[PDB]
Amino acid sequence: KVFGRCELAAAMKRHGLDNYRGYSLGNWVCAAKFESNFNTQATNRNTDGSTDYGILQINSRWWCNDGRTPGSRNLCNIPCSALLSSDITASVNCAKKIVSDGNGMNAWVAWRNRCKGTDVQAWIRGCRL
């Protein structure tokens, strides 16, 4: 599924991401835009054999198990395919564990590179939340 900006903002809010661990809703919508461009089915292979999955591009080396990644830790305890669902629940539950890991949202390079320090509130303006 390709989410529209406001539709995603609404869904992440309902799933409790607004201000979770100190990050306002806009950070999350911004990270999804530059990570996957709002697509639940995006995937990306890396040089180390891992793959990034779904709307928040969660990596198979530390977080989910895809059965083909050397060094897998599966810290969210979930199959990587559950993160490609049109329902963002599994991705949100795992994102919550990743951000509690001590490095906040720096876990997402696109957030780091394109959202951190900008007016992330731009991402939720115009939406009826």
Swiss-Prot record:
Active-site residue numbers: 35, 52
Pfam family, one: Lys
Gene3D superfamilies reported in the protein's UniProt record: 1.10.530.10
Cell compartment(s), UniProt: Secreted
Molecular function GO labels: beta-N-acetylglucosaminidase activity; identical protein binding; lysozyme activity
Function recorded in the entry: Lysozymes have primarily a bacteriolytic function; those in tissues and body fluids are associated with the monocyte-macrophage system and enhance the activity of immunoagents. Has bacteriolytic activity against M.luteus.
Note: Lysozyme C is capable of both hydrolysis and transglycosylation; it also shows a slight esterase activity. It acts rapidly on both peptide-substituted and unsubstituted peptidoglycan, and slowly on chitin oligosaccharides.
Name this protein carries in UniProt: Lysozyme C
